[PDB]
């Protein structure tokens, strides 16, 4: 996964990537294997973006979809 | 026929959950900064804060009161997989002291609730892994000791739980658990467990097949001496269901009691994901809050039909 690399504004050590319908998260301090992997979507992903006004919030939009999927990574 | 007003209470962070005491003279509020505040109402009718402290390392989801017969006890669930019990000690400035913590959950503790008074001092905690744990304190004079009495697996992500407030001698204890899983498959999202005295174990009794959308809130209504049970479910549309027990044959007493399920009201005026549902003291008025920033109060009519009675906005401006 090398597309859509982005860093959480609140956590500078958190990065995200996505290949096809699968999305992975990495921690730059220990970036050897992906920290977590989101559930693969049927339609390929199209955009991934972190929320700047809310901590640990990620948004994803896929191809030909009328719904945007939000993920709360603030658990840890 | 509902009018609104703003209470002169000052909060610095976003308020997550608010809860009343039994007599309605004490309020407990959870903030977004892992903070808990207690407010008391004066004789003149004004509200004043009396305590404040930080509780957990993670976010604080729910905080609830206990019955006054056991004193002043609060229970708080946290996203840090913990559930803390706090008791107030005054010597007079109030000094709340934590008495016990349950961390048996392997996932984030999603909900925490207290059992009815007639069943002793019990507590239930539903976690995100699909585990509901019911613990009891054998001694009411020693808050620091607790024992895990029951554990139930739901095979689905628990999101909310509710006890049955019935206190009759003919109704076994009942607990209902919802789910917020958004799996594409059409699966049941509400199940009910009824305790069995002959086995001293809780068993699944009925599953709501008609509910397949994710469920955010479930609320039993006060019994108040009726012959059946009233349940409210919060989803994309608010639903009301009635459960009536069937006459148990005297030939043999077996497993869970059979019930007849009928829907009596289904409102979709919110046109969004309803978030909270609550009952009044008498179980005659239902309050619902959804994503539309509006609060809807529903009540029955002369023809025993359910219709909206009040509409309000989050800002307090009447509609």
């Amino acid at each position: 996964a090398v597309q859509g690399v982005t860093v959480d504004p609140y956590f500078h050590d958190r990065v995200a990537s996505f290949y096809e319908g699968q999305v992975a998260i990495w921690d730059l301090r220990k970036f050897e294997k992906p920290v977590l992997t989101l559930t693969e979507q049927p339609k390929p992903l199209t955009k991934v973006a972190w929320c700047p006004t809310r901590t640990g919030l990620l948004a994803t939009l896929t191809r030909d979809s009328n719904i945007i999927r939000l993920y709360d990574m603030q658990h840890t | 026929m509902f009018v609104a007003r703003s209470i002169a209470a000052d909060h610095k962070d976003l308020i997550h959950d608010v809860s009343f005491d039994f007599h309605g003279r004490r309020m407990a509020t959870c903030s977004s900064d892992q903070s808990v505040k207690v407010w008391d109402k004066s004789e003149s009718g004004d509200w004043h804060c009396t305590a404040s402290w930080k509780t957990h390392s993670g976010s604080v989801w729910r905080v609830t009161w206990a019955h006054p017969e056991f004193g002043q006890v609060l229970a708080s669930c946290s996203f840090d997989r913990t559930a803390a019990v706090w008791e107030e000690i005054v010597g007079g400035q109030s000094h709340w002291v934590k008495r016990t913590t349950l961390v048996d959950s392997r996932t984030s503790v999603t909900d925490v609730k207290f059992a009815p008074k007639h069943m002793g001092l019990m507590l239930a905690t539903c976690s995100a892994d699909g585990i509901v744990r019911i613990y009891e304190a054998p001694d009411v004079m020693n808050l620091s000791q607790w024992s895990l009495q029951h554990e139930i697996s739901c095979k689905l992500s628990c999101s909310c739980i509710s006890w049955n407030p019935s206190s009759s001698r003919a109704h076994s204890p009942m607990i209902a658990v919802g789910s917020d899983d958004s799996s594409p498959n059409a699966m049941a999202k509400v199940q009910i467990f009824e305790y069995n005295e002959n086995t001293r174990k809780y068993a699944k009794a009925e599953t709501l097949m008609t509910v397949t959308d994710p469920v955010h809130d479930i609320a039993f209504a006060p019994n108040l001496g009726r012959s059946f049970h009233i349940l409210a479910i919060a989803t994309k549309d608010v639903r009301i269901f009635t459960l009536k027990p069937v006459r148990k044959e005297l030939t043999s007493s077996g497993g869970p009691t059979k019930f007849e399920i009928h829907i009596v009201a289904q409102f979709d005026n919110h046109n969004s994901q309803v978030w909270r549902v609550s009952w009044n003291i008498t179980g005659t008025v239902l309050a619902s809050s959804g994503d539309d920033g509006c609060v809807r109060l529903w009540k029955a009519n002369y023809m025993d039909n359910w219709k909206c009675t009040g509409i309000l906005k989050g800002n307090g401006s009447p509609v």
């Binding site: - | 006054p68 017969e69 004193g71 054998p138 001694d139 009411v140 004079m141 020693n142």
Partner: protein, 108 residues
Amino acid sequence: GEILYRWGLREKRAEVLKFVSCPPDPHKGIEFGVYCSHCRSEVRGTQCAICKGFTFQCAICHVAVRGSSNFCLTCGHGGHTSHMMEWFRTQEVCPTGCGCHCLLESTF
């Protein structure tokens, strides 16, 4: 302290006697026990030893009682001091419906 008591001032006597190093001995005689509100057993204390719950509950507020309390020896009912004072300020029957005139049966 004895001189103060002879003078008629009582509170000062207690205040002075609170500084005595040697404590006195407890009363050896008649004592009061409470029937448990749950197991109905004889419990010598504010908390039951069997049911582990509160044994004494107010007859007015129906809350557990832990401090000062008053009760009728003839009827066996009682509760919080302030609550019962307020109740008997105007009324003259036992507030639990026992029918006992607790004032006339208690004020000996």
